[PDB]
Amino acid sequence: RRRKLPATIILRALNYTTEQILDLFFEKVIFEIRDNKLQMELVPERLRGE
Amino acid sequence: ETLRVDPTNDRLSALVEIYRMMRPGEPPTREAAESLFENLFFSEDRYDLS
Amino acid sequence: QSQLKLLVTRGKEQGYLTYAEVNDHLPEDIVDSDQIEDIIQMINDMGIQVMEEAPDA
């Protein structure tokens, strides 16, 4: 019960880098750049309410 | 957003930031900054949910 | 800027004088017995003008 800090500071204290931090809360989305254009790993379920 | 407001960037800066938040006074070191955080949630003589 | 804007805009007037709030929104080494009386003195009593004497101090 002290002063506030961003709750990722303890994660780094557990030897977690920022990228690992991002890959522990969120679902990644991979994009590909082929044939001089931009593609996307589309997931139909994710497009709910957009 | 939490990572966006995080001053620390690695393990040293984190444990040191915790060391400066808990015991605001003496210059944060390596052993002290680490042993403190370990003796908070990772030590039987200092932490126990029973 | 930071302290001034955060203190004023938040406290309007925090109703029941939420002490355990902005004290965490302050820099330097915390858990002191010095910075305590300097917030309990401004909030009430001489309201409005006291909040303009604080930042200048």
Side-chain angles (χ1 to χ4, degrees), chain A residues 2-10 12-18 21-22 26, chain B residues 2-3 5-11 14-15 17-18 20-22 24 37 42:
Chain A
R2 292 182 179 267
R3 59 183 182 91
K4 301 188 297 81
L5 301 176
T8 51
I9 192 180
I10 182 180
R12 299 182 186 273
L14 295 182
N15 215 18
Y16 276 104
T17 62
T18 305
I21 300 181
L22 294 171
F26 309 120
Chain B
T2 303
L3 279 174
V5 293
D6 184 31
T8 61
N9 45 13
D10 63 332
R11 184 174 183 267
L15 295 173
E17 182 64 21
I18 294 180
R20 190 176 57 84
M21 193 279 296
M22 292 295 302
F37 179 80
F42 315 96

PDB file of all heavy atoms in Angstrom, chain A residues 2-10 12-18 21-22 26, chain B residues 2-3 5-11 14-15 17-18 20-22 24 37 42:
ATOM      1  N   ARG A   2       1.528   1.518  -1.118  1.00  0.00           N
ATOM      2  CA  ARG A   2       2.338   2.722  -1.277  1.00  0.00           C
ATOM      3  C   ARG A   2       1.924   3.520  -2.513  1.00  0.00           C
ATOM      4  O   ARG A   2       0.773   3.456  -2.947  1.00  0.00           O
ATOM      5  CB  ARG A   2       3.819   2.354  -1.367  1.00  0.00           C
ATOM      6  CG  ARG A   2       4.403   1.805  -0.076  1.00  0.00           C
ATOM      7  CD  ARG A   2       5.886   1.506  -0.231  1.00  0.00           C
ATOM      8  NE  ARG A   2       6.479   0.997   1.002  1.00  0.00           N
ATOM      9  CZ  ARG A   2       7.078   1.756   1.913  1.00  0.00           C
ATOM     10  NH1 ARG A   2       7.169   3.065   1.731  1.00  0.00           N
ATOM     11  NH2 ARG A   2       7.589   1.206   3.006  1.00  0.00           N
ATOM     12  N   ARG A   3       2.869   4.268  -3.074  1.00  0.00           N
ATOM     13  CA  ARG A   3       2.618   5.063  -4.273  1.00  0.00           C
ATOM     14  C   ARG A   3       2.555   4.200  -5.533  1.00  0.00           C
ATOM     15  O   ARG A   3       3.190   3.148  -5.610  1.00  0.00           O
ATOM     16  CB  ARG A   3       3.686   6.149  -4.426  1.00  0.00           C
ATOM     17  CG  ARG A   3       5.105   5.624  -4.532  1.00  0.00           C
ATOM     18  CD  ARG A   3       6.098   6.773  -4.603  1.00  0.00           C
ATOM     19  NE  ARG A   3       7.475   6.309  -4.744  1.00  0.00           N
ATOM     20  CZ  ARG A   3       8.079   6.111  -5.911  1.00  0.00           C
ATOM     21  NH1 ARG A   3       7.427   6.335  -7.044  1.00  0.00           N
ATOM     22  NH2 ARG A   3       9.335   5.688  -5.946  1.00  0.00           N
ATOM     23  N   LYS A   4       1.785   4.658  -6.515  1.00  0.00           N
ATOM     24  CA  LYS A   4       1.509   3.880  -7.722  1.00  0.00           C
ATOM     25  C   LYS A   4       2.650   3.838  -8.738  1.00  0.00           C
ATOM     26  O   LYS A   4       3.388   4.807  -8.912  1.00  0.00           O
ATOM     27  CB  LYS A   4       0.253   4.418  -8.413  1.00  0.00           C
ATOM     28  CG  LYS A   4      -0.997   4.379  -7.554  1.00  0.00           C
ATOM     29  CD  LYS A   4      -2.237   4.746  -8.355  1.00  0.00           C
ATOM     30  CE  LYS A   4      -2.173   6.175  -8.880  1.00  0.00           C
ATOM     31  NZ  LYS A   4      -1.349   6.299 -10.115  1.00  0.00           N
ATOM     32  N   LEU A   5       2.771   2.695  -9.406  1.00  0.00           N
ATOM     33  CA  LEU A   5       3.694   2.511 -10.519  1.00  0.00           C
ATOM     34  C   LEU A   5       3.010   1.673 -11.594  1.00  0.00           C
ATOM     35  O   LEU A   5       2.149   0.851 -11.277  1.00  0.00           O
ATOM     36  CB  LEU A   5       4.989   1.835 -10.061  1.00  0.00           C
ATOM     37  CG  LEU A   5       5.828   2.510  -8.974  1.00  0.00           C
ATOM     38  CD1 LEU A   5       7.005   1.626  -8.589  1.00  0.00           C
ATOM     39  CD2 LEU A   5       6.313   3.877  -9.432  1.00  0.00           C
ATOM     40  N   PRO A   6       3.369   1.891 -12.869  1.00  0.00           N
ATOM     41  CA  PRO A   6       2.826   1.060 -13.951  1.00  0.00           C
ATOM     42  C   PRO A   6       3.075  -0.424 -13.687  1.00  0.00           C
ATOM     43  O   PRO A   6       4.212  -0.823 -13.435  1.00  0.00           O
ATOM     44  CB  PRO A   6       3.592   1.545 -15.181  1.00  0.00           C
ATOM     45  CG  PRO A   6       3.931   2.961 -14.861  1.00  0.00           C
ATOM     46  CD  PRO A   6       4.212   2.983 -13.382  1.00  0.00           C
ATOM     47  N   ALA A   7       2.016  -1.228 -13.754  1.00  0.00           N
ATOM     48  CA  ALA A   7       2.070  -2.624 -13.324  1.00  0.00           C
ATOM     49  C   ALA A   7       2.903  -3.532 -14.229  1.00  0.00           C
ATOM     50  O   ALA A   7       2.853  -4.755 -14.099  1.00  0.00           O
ATOM     51  CB  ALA A   7       0.655  -3.175 -13.205  1.00  0.00           C
ATOM     52  N   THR A   8       3.673  -2.939 -15.134  1.00  0.00           N
ATOM     53  CA  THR A   8       4.581  -3.707 -15.979  1.00  0.00           C
ATOM     54  C   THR A   8       5.986  -3.654 -15.395  1.00  0.00           C
ATOM     55  O   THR A   8       6.891  -4.354 -15.850  1.00  0.00           O
ATOM     56  CB  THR A   8       4.605  -3.187 -17.427  1.00  0.00           C
ATOM     57  OG1 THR A   8       4.827  -1.772 -17.429  1.00  0.00           O
ATOM     58  CG2 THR A   8       3.288  -3.495 -18.125  1.00  0.00           C
ATOM     59  N   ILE A   9       6.153  -2.815 -14.379  1.00  0.00           N
ATOM     60  CA  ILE A   9       7.447  -2.612 -13.744  1.00  0.00           C
ATOM     61  C   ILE A   9       7.858  -3.844 -12.942  1.00  0.00           C
ATOM     62  O   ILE A   9       9.044  -4.148 -12.819  1.00  0.00           O
ATOM     63  CB  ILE A   9       7.426  -1.375 -12.824  1.00  0.00           C
ATOM     64  CG1 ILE A   9       8.843  -0.993 -12.394  1.00  0.00           C
ATOM     65  CG2 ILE A   9       6.532  -1.620 -11.617  1.00  0.00           C
ATOM     66  CD1 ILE A   9       8.894   0.219 -11.490  1.00  0.00           C
ATOM     67  N   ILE A  10       6.871  -4.545 -12.393  1.00  0.00           N
ATOM     68  CA  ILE A  10       7.127  -5.787 -11.674  1.00  0.00           C
ATOM     69  C   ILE A  10       7.431  -6.913 -12.657  1.00  0.00           C
ATOM     70  O   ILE A  10       8.186  -7.834 -12.349  1.00  0.00           O
ATOM     71  CB  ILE A  10       5.938  -6.192 -10.786  1.00  0.00           C
ATOM     72  CG1 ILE A  10       6.265  -7.472 -10.013  1.00  0.00           C
ATOM     73  CG2 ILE A  10       4.683  -6.374 -11.625  1.00  0.00           C
ATOM     74  CD1 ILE A  10       5.149  -7.944  -9.111  1.00  0.00           C
ATOM     75  N   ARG A  12       9.061  -6.547 -15.502  1.00  0.00           N
ATOM     76  CA  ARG A  12      10.468  -6.356 -15.821  1.00  0.00           C
ATOM     77  C   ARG A  12      11.327  -6.797 -14.642  1.00  0.00           C
ATOM     78  O   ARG A  12      12.469  -7.221 -14.814  1.00  0.00           O
ATOM     79  CB  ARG A  12      10.751  -4.896 -16.177  1.00  0.00           C
ATOM     80  CG  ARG A  12       9.987  -4.403 -17.396  1.00  0.00           C
ATOM     81  CD  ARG A  12      10.345  -2.967 -17.742  1.00  0.00           C
ATOM     82  NE  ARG A  12       9.511  -2.446 -18.821  1.00  0.00           N
ATOM     83  CZ  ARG A  12       9.784  -2.592 -20.114  1.00  0.00           C
ATOM     84  NH1 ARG A  12      10.871  -3.249 -20.494  1.00  0.00           N
ATOM     85  NH2 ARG A  12       8.968  -2.084 -21.027  1.00  0.00           N
ATOM     86  N   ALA A  13      10.763  -6.692 -13.442  1.00  0.00           N
ATOM     87  CA  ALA A  13      11.447  -7.122 -12.230  1.00  0.00           C
ATOM     88  C   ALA A  13      11.520  -8.644 -12.158  1.00  0.00           C
ATOM     89  O   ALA A  13      12.322  -9.203 -11.412  1.00  0.00           O
ATOM     90  CB  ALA A  13      10.747  -6.565 -11.001  1.00  0.00           C
ATOM     91  N   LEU A  14      10.674  -9.309 -12.940  1.00  0.00           N
ATOM     92  CA  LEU A  14      10.690 -10.763 -13.031  1.00  0.00           C
ATOM     93  C   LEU A  14      11.453 -11.187 -14.278  1.00  0.00           C
ATOM     94  O   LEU A  14      11.275 -12.293 -14.788  1.00  0.00           O
ATOM     95  CB  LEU A  14       9.268 -11.327 -13.056  1.00  0.00           C
ATOM     96  CG  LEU A  14       8.415 -11.116 -11.804  1.00  0.00           C
ATOM     97  CD1 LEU A  14       7.057 -11.774 -11.973  1.00  0.00           C
ATOM     98  CD2 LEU A  14       9.124 -11.658 -10.573  1.00  0.00           C
ATOM     99  N   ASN A  15      12.311 -10.292 -14.755  1.00  0.00           N
ATOM    100  CA  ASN A  15      13.102 -10.522 -15.956  1.00  0.00           C
ATOM    101  C   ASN A  15      12.236 -10.774 -17.189  1.00  0.00           C
ATOM    102  O   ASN A  15      12.412 -11.764 -17.898  1.00  0.00           O
ATOM    103  CB  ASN A  15      14.065 -11.691 -15.739  1.00  0.00           C
ATOM    104  CG  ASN A  15      15.384 -11.498 -16.461  1.00  0.00           C
ATOM    105  OD1 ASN A  15      15.736 -10.381 -16.845  1.00  0.00           O
ATOM    106  ND2 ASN A  15      16.121 -12.585 -16.649  1.00  0.00           N
ATOM    107  N   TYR A  16      11.299  -9.862 -17.434  1.00  0.00           N
ATOM    108  CA  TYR A  16      10.482  -9.883 -18.643  1.00  0.00           C
ATOM    109  C   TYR A  16      10.761  -8.651 -19.497  1.00  0.00           C
ATOM    110  O   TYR A  16      10.598  -7.521 -19.032  1.00  0.00           O
ATOM    111  CB  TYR A  16       8.988  -9.928 -18.304  1.00  0.00           C
ATOM    112  CG  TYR A  16       8.418 -11.298 -18.013  1.00  0.00           C
ATOM    113  CD1 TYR A  16       8.138 -11.694 -16.712  1.00  0.00           C
ATOM    114  CD2 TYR A  16       8.118 -12.180 -19.044  1.00  0.00           C
ATOM    115  CE1 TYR A  16       7.600 -12.938 -16.444  1.00  0.00           C
ATOM    116  CE2 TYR A  16       7.581 -13.427 -18.786  1.00  0.00           C
ATOM    117  CZ  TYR A  16       7.323 -13.801 -17.484  1.00  0.00           C
ATOM    118  OH  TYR A  16       6.787 -15.041 -17.223  1.00  0.00           O
ATOM    119  N   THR A  17      11.185  -8.862 -20.738  1.00  0.00           N
ATOM    120  CA  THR A  17      11.379  -7.748 -21.657  1.00  0.00           C
ATOM    121  C   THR A  17      10.024  -7.268 -22.169  1.00  0.00           C
ATOM    122  O   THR A  17       9.014  -7.951 -21.998  1.00  0.00           O
ATOM    123  CB  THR A  17      12.287  -8.129 -22.839  1.00  0.00           C
ATOM    124  OG1 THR A  17      11.673  -9.176 -23.600  1.00  0.00           O
ATOM    125  CG2 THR A  17      13.640  -8.606 -22.335  1.00  0.00           C
ATOM    126  N   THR A  18      10.008  -6.099 -22.801  1.00  0.00           N
ATOM    127  CA  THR A  18       8.767  -5.495 -23.286  1.00  0.00           C
ATOM    128  C   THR A  18       8.004  -6.366 -24.282  1.00  0.00           C
ATOM    129  O   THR A  18       6.778  -6.453 -24.222  1.00  0.00           O
ATOM    130  CB  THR A  18       9.033  -4.133 -23.950  1.00  0.00           C
ATOM    131  OG1 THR A  18       9.734  -3.279 -23.037  1.00  0.00           O
ATOM    132  CG2 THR A  18       7.721  -3.474 -24.351  1.00  0.00           C
ATOM    133  N   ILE A  21       6.291  -9.070 -22.540  1.00  0.00           N
ATOM    134  CA  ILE A  21       5.162  -8.472 -21.839  1.00  0.00           C
ATOM    135  C   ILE A  21       3.956  -8.367 -22.766  1.00  0.00           C
ATOM    136  O   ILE A  21       2.826  -8.645 -22.367  1.00  0.00           O
ATOM    137  CB  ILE A  21       5.510  -7.071 -21.296  1.00  0.00           C
ATOM    138  CG1 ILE A  21       6.684  -7.151 -20.318  1.00  0.00           C
ATOM    139  CG2 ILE A  21       4.296  -6.440 -20.630  1.00  0.00           C
ATOM    140  CD1 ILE A  21       7.077  -5.816 -19.724  1.00  0.00           C
ATOM    141  N   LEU A  22       4.207  -7.966 -24.007  1.00  0.00           N
ATOM    142  CA  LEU A  22       3.149  -7.826 -25.000  1.00  0.00           C
ATOM    143  C   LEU A  22       2.583  -9.182 -25.414  1.00  0.00           C
ATOM    144  O   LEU A  22       1.419  -9.284 -25.802  1.00  0.00           O
ATOM    145  CB  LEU A  22       3.672  -7.082 -26.230  1.00  0.00           C
ATOM    146  CG  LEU A  22       4.059  -5.618 -26.013  1.00  0.00           C
ATOM    147  CD1 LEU A  22       4.772  -5.063 -27.238  1.00  0.00           C
ATOM    148  CD2 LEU A  22       2.834  -4.782 -25.675  1.00  0.00           C
ATOM    149  N   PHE A  26      -1.831  -9.873 -24.868  1.00  0.00           N
ATOM    150  CA  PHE A  26      -2.530  -9.656 -26.128  1.00  0.00           C
ATOM    151  C   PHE A  26      -2.350 -10.797 -27.125  1.00  0.00           C
ATOM    152  O   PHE A  26      -1.419 -11.595 -27.018  1.00  0.00           O
ATOM    153  CB  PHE A  26      -2.055  -8.347 -26.758  1.00  0.00           C
ATOM    154  CG  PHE A  26      -2.098  -7.177 -25.819  1.00  0.00           C
ATOM    155  CD1 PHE A  26      -0.942  -6.478 -25.513  1.00  0.00           C
ATOM    156  CD2 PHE A  26      -3.288  -6.783 -25.232  1.00  0.00           C
ATOM    157  CE1 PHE A  26      -0.975  -5.404 -24.645  1.00  0.00           C
ATOM    158  CE2 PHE A  26      -3.327  -5.708 -24.364  1.00  0.00           C
ATOM    159  CZ  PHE A  26      -2.168  -5.018 -24.070  1.00  0.00           C
TER     160      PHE A  26
ATOM    161  N   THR B   2      -0.130   1.064 -20.186  1.00  0.00           N
ATOM    162  CA  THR B   2       0.710   0.931 -19.001  1.00  0.00           C
ATOM    163  C   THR B   2       2.191   0.961 -19.366  1.00  0.00           C
ATOM    164  O   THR B   2       2.996   1.588 -18.676  1.00  0.00           O
ATOM    165  CB  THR B   2       0.407  -0.375 -18.240  1.00  0.00           C
ATOM    166  OG1 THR B   2      -0.983  -0.418 -17.895  1.00  0.00           O
ATOM    167  CG2 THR B   2       1.242  -0.458 -16.971  1.00  0.00           C
ATOM    168  N   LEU B   3       2.546   0.279 -20.451  1.00  0.00           N
ATOM    169  CA  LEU B   3       3.918   0.292 -20.949  1.00  0.00           C
ATOM    170  C   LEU B   3       4.311   1.669 -21.473  1.00  0.00           C
ATOM    171  O   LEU B   3       5.486   2.040 -21.447  1.00  0.00           O
ATOM    172  CB  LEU B   3       4.103  -0.754 -22.051  1.00  0.00           C
ATOM    173  CG  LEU B   3       4.332  -2.197 -21.602  1.00  0.00           C
ATOM    174  CD1 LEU B   3       4.350  -3.131 -22.803  1.00  0.00           C
ATOM    175  CD2 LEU B   3       5.625  -2.309 -20.811  1.00  0.00           C
ATOM    176  N   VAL B   5       3.508   4.482 -20.155  1.00  0.00           N
ATOM    177  CA  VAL B   5       3.837   5.341 -19.023  1.00  0.00           C
ATOM    178  C   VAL B   5       4.843   4.689 -18.079  1.00  0.00           C
ATOM    179  O   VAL B   5       4.821   4.935 -16.874  1.00  0.00           O
ATOM    180  CB  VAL B   5       2.579   5.722 -18.221  1.00  0.00           C
ATOM    181  CG1 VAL B   5       1.678   6.620 -19.052  1.00  0.00           C
ATOM    182  CG2 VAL B   5       1.837   4.474 -17.774  1.00  0.00           C
ATOM    183  N   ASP B   6       5.726   3.866 -18.633  1.00  0.00           N
ATOM    184  CA  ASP B   6       6.708   3.147 -17.828  1.00  0.00           C
ATOM    185  C   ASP B   6       8.124   3.675 -18.028  1.00  0.00           C
ATOM    186  O   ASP B   6       8.722   3.477 -19.084  1.00  0.00           O
ATOM    187  CB  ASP B   6       6.666   1.654 -18.151  1.00  0.00           C
ATOM    188  CG  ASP B   6       7.603   0.844 -17.277  1.00  0.00           C
ATOM    189  OD1 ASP B   6       7.832   1.246 -16.117  1.00  0.00           O
ATOM    190  OD2 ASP B   6       8.116  -0.189 -17.755  1.00  0.00           O
ATOM    191  N   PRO B   7       8.662   4.353 -17.003  1.00  0.00           N
ATOM    192  CA  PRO B   7      10.015   4.919 -17.031  1.00  0.00           C
ATOM    193  C   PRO B   7      11.088   3.843 -17.181  1.00  0.00           C
ATOM    194  O   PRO B   7      12.032   4.014 -17.955  1.00  0.00           O
ATOM    195  CB  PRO B   7      10.131   5.616 -15.671  1.00  0.00           C
ATOM    196  CG  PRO B   7       8.722   5.882 -15.257  1.00  0.00           C
ATOM    197  CD  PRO B   7       7.940   4.714 -15.771  1.00  0.00           C
ATOM    198  N   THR B   8      10.945   2.750 -16.438  1.00  0.00           N
ATOM    199  CA  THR B   8      11.905   1.654 -16.493  1.00  0.00           C
ATOM    200  C   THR B   8      11.877   0.972 -17.856  1.00  0.00           C
ATOM    201  O   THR B   8      10.860   0.995 -18.548  1.00  0.00           O
ATOM    202  CB  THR B   8      11.626   0.606 -15.400  1.00  0.00           C
ATOM    203  OG1 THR B   8      10.321   0.046 -15.596  1.00  0.00           O
ATOM    204  CG2 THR B   8      11.699   1.240 -14.020  1.00  0.00           C
ATOM    205  N   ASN B   9      12.995   0.363 -18.237  1.00  0.00           N
ATOM    206  CA  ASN B   9      13.097  -0.295 -19.534  1.00  0.00           C
ATOM    207  C   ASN B   9      13.662  -1.712 -19.448  1.00  0.00           C
ATOM    208  O   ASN B   9      13.502  -2.505 -20.376  1.00  0.00           O
ATOM    209  CB  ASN B   9      13.949   0.549 -20.484  1.00  0.00           C
ATOM    210  CG  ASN B   9      15.213   1.066 -19.828  1.00  0.00           C
ATOM    211  OD1 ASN B   9      15.592   0.620 -18.745  1.00  0.00           O
ATOM    212  ND2 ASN B   9      15.873   2.016 -20.481  1.00  0.00           N
ATOM    213  N   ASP B  10      14.319  -2.028 -18.336  1.00  0.00           N
ATOM    214  CA  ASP B  10      14.902  -3.354 -18.153  1.00  0.00           C
ATOM    215  C   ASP B  10      14.685  -3.871 -16.733  1.00  0.00           C
ATOM    216  O   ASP B  10      13.804  -3.395 -16.016  1.00  0.00           O
ATOM    217  CB  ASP B  10      16.396  -3.337 -18.487  1.00  0.00           C
ATOM    218  CG  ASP B  10      17.193  -2.441 -17.561  1.00  0.00           C
ATOM    219  OD1 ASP B  10      16.622  -1.460 -17.042  1.00  0.00           O
ATOM    220  OD2 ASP B  10      18.394  -2.719 -17.355  1.00  0.00           O
ATOM    221  N   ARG B  11      15.493  -4.849 -16.332  1.00  0.00           N
ATOM    222  CA  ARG B  11      15.360  -5.466 -15.015  1.00  0.00           C
ATOM    223  C   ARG B  11      16.020  -4.645 -13.913  1.00  0.00           C
ATOM    224  O   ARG B  11      15.507  -4.568 -12.796  1.00  0.00           O
ATOM    225  CB  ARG B  11      15.956  -6.875 -15.029  1.00  0.00           C
ATOM    226  CG  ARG B  11      15.770  -7.639 -13.728  1.00  0.00           C
ATOM    227  CD  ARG B  11      16.250  -9.076 -13.859  1.00  0.00           C
ATOM    228  NE  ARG B  11      16.022  -9.844 -12.638  1.00  0.00           N
ATOM    229  CZ  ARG B  11      16.919  -9.992 -11.669  1.00  0.00           C
ATOM    230  NH1 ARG B  11      18.112  -9.422 -11.772  1.00  0.00           N
ATOM    231  NH2 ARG B  11      16.623 -10.710 -10.593  1.00  0.00           N
ATOM    232  N   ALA B  14      13.989  -1.434 -13.112  1.00  0.00           N
ATOM    233  CA  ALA B  14      12.755  -1.809 -12.429  1.00  0.00           C
ATOM    234  C   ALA B  14      12.988  -2.077 -10.943  1.00  0.00           C
ATOM    235  O   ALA B  14      12.387  -1.428 -10.087  1.00  0.00           O
ATOM    236  CB  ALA B  14      12.134  -3.029 -13.093  1.00  0.00           C
ATOM    237  N   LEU B  15      13.861  -3.038 -10.647  1.00  0.00           N
ATOM    238  CA  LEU B  15      14.163  -3.414  -9.267  1.00  0.00           C
ATOM    239  C   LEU B  15      14.688  -2.229  -8.468  1.00  0.00           C
ATOM    240  O   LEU B  15      14.451  -2.124  -7.264  1.00  0.00           O
ATOM    241  CB  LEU B  15      15.185  -4.553  -9.231  1.00  0.00           C
ATOM    242  CG  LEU B  15      14.761  -5.905  -9.806  1.00  0.00           C
ATOM    243  CD1 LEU B  15      15.946  -6.854  -9.847  1.00  0.00           C
ATOM    244  CD2 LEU B  15      13.623  -6.498  -8.993  1.00  0.00           C
ATOM    245  N   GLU B  17      13.850   0.954  -9.173  1.00  0.00           N
ATOM    246  CA  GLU B  17      12.698   1.830  -9.001  1.00  0.00           C
ATOM    247  C   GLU B  17      11.829   1.363  -7.838  1.00  0.00           C
ATOM    248  O   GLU B  17      11.302   2.177  -7.080  1.00  0.00           O
ATOM    249  CB  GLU B  17      11.868   1.893 -10.282  1.00  0.00           C
ATOM    250  CG  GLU B  17      10.680   2.834 -10.196  1.00  0.00           C
ATOM    251  CD  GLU B  17      11.100   4.277  -9.997  1.00  0.00           C
ATOM    252  OE1 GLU B  17      12.262   4.607 -10.312  1.00  0.00           O
ATOM    253  OE2 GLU B  17      10.267   5.081  -9.528  1.00  0.00           O
ATOM    254  N   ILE B  18      11.675   0.050  -7.709  1.00  0.00           N
ATOM    255  CA  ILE B  18      10.971  -0.526  -6.569  1.00  0.00           C
ATOM    256  C   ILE B  18      11.731  -0.261  -5.276  1.00  0.00           C
ATOM    257  O   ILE B  18      11.136   0.031  -4.240  1.00  0.00           O
ATOM    258  CB  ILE B  18      10.766  -2.041  -6.735  1.00  0.00           C
ATOM    259  CG1 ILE B  18       9.822  -2.321  -7.904  1.00  0.00           C
ATOM    260  CG2 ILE B  18      10.222  -2.649  -5.450  1.00  0.00           C
ATOM    261  CD1 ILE B  18       9.570  -3.789  -8.146  1.00  0.00           C
ATOM    262  N   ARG B  20      13.621   2.220  -4.649  1.00  0.00           N
ATOM    263  CA  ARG B  20      13.537   3.639  -4.325  1.00  0.00           C
ATOM    264  C   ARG B  20      12.137   4.025  -3.857  1.00  0.00           C
ATOM    265  O   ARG B  20      11.954   5.043  -3.189  1.00  0.00           O
ATOM    266  CB  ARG B  20      13.942   4.486  -5.536  1.00  0.00           C
ATOM    267  CG  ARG B  20      14.114   5.965  -5.233  1.00  0.00           C
ATOM    268  CD  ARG B  20      14.604   6.722  -6.457  1.00  0.00           C
ATOM    269  NE  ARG B  20      13.707   6.560  -7.597  1.00  0.00           N
ATOM    270  CZ  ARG B  20      12.619   7.294  -7.802  1.00  0.00           C
ATOM    271  NH1 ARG B  20      12.288   8.248  -6.944  1.00  0.00           N
ATOM    272  NH2 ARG B  20      11.862   7.077  -8.869  1.00  0.00           N
ATOM    273  N   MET B  21      11.151   3.207  -4.210  1.00  0.00           N
ATOM    274  CA  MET B  21       9.771   3.448  -3.806  1.00  0.00           C
ATOM    275  C   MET B  21       9.512   2.923  -2.395  1.00  0.00           C
ATOM    276  O   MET B  21       8.833   3.568  -1.596  1.00  0.00           O
ATOM    277  CB  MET B  21       8.805   2.802  -4.804  1.00  0.00           C
ATOM    278  CG  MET B  21       7.355   3.241  -4.657  1.00  0.00           C
ATOM    279  SD  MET B  21       6.461   2.399  -3.339  1.00  0.00           S
ATOM    280  CE  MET B  21       6.489   0.711  -3.934  1.00  0.00           C
ATOM    281  N   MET B  22      10.060   1.749  -2.099  1.00  0.00           N
ATOM    282  CA  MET B  22       9.884   1.115  -0.795  1.00  0.00           C
ATOM    283  C   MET B  22      10.763   1.763   0.271  1.00  0.00           C
ATOM    284  O   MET B  22      10.276   2.182   1.320  1.00  0.00           O
ATOM    285  CB  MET B  22      10.194  -0.381  -0.880  1.00  0.00           C
ATOM    286  CG  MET B  22       9.206  -1.186  -1.705  1.00  0.00           C
ATOM    287  SD  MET B  22       7.560  -1.205  -0.972  1.00  0.00           S
ATOM    288  CE  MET B  22       7.919  -1.906   0.637  1.00  0.00           C
ATOM    289  N   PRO B  24      12.928   4.803   0.368  1.00  0.00           N
ATOM    290  CA  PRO B  24      13.392   6.073  -0.196  1.00  0.00           C
ATOM    291  C   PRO B  24      14.473   6.725   0.660  1.00  0.00           C
ATOM    292  O   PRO B  24      14.160   7.371   1.661  1.00  0.00           O
ATOM    293  CB  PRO B  24      12.126   6.928  -0.216  1.00  0.00           C
ATOM    294  CG  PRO B  24      11.307   6.395   0.907  1.00  0.00           C
ATOM    295  CD  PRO B  24      11.580   4.917   0.953  1.00  0.00           C
ATOM    296  N   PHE B  37      13.331  -6.944  -3.407  1.00  0.00           N
ATOM    297  CA  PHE B  37      12.200  -7.350  -4.222  1.00  0.00           C
ATOM    298  C   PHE B  37      11.960  -8.850  -4.111  1.00  0.00           C
ATOM    299  O   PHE B  37      10.827  -9.319  -4.222  1.00  0.00           O
ATOM    300  CB  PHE B  37      12.428  -6.948  -5.677  1.00  0.00           C
ATOM    301  CG  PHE B  37      11.318  -7.353  -6.592  1.00  0.00           C
ATOM    302  CD1 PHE B  37      10.157  -6.605  -6.665  1.00  0.00           C
ATOM    303  CD2 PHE B  37      11.439  -8.477  -7.389  1.00  0.00           C
ATOM    304  CE1 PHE B  37       9.131  -6.976  -7.509  1.00  0.00           C
ATOM    305  CE2 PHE B  37      10.419  -8.853  -8.237  1.00  0.00           C
ATOM    306  CZ  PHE B  37       9.263  -8.102  -8.298  1.00  0.00           C
ATOM    307  N   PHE B  42       8.846 -13.465  -2.754  1.00  0.00           N
ATOM    308  CA  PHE B  42       9.574 -14.665  -3.152  1.00  0.00           C
ATOM    309  C   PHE B  42      10.483 -15.182  -2.040  1.00  0.00           C
ATOM    310  O   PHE B  42      11.597 -15.638  -2.301  1.00  0.00           O
ATOM    311  CB  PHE B  42      10.394 -14.380  -4.413  1.00  0.00           C
ATOM    312  CG  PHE B  42       9.633 -13.632  -5.471  1.00  0.00           C
ATOM    313  CD1 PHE B  42       9.737 -12.254  -5.570  1.00  0.00           C
ATOM    314  CD2 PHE B  42       8.801 -14.300  -6.353  1.00  0.00           C
ATOM    315  CE1 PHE B  42       9.036 -11.558  -6.534  1.00  0.00           C
ATOM    316  CE2 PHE B  42       8.096 -13.608  -7.321  1.00  0.00           C
ATOM    317  CZ  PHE B  42       8.213 -12.236  -7.411  1.00  0.00           C
TER     318      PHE B  42
END
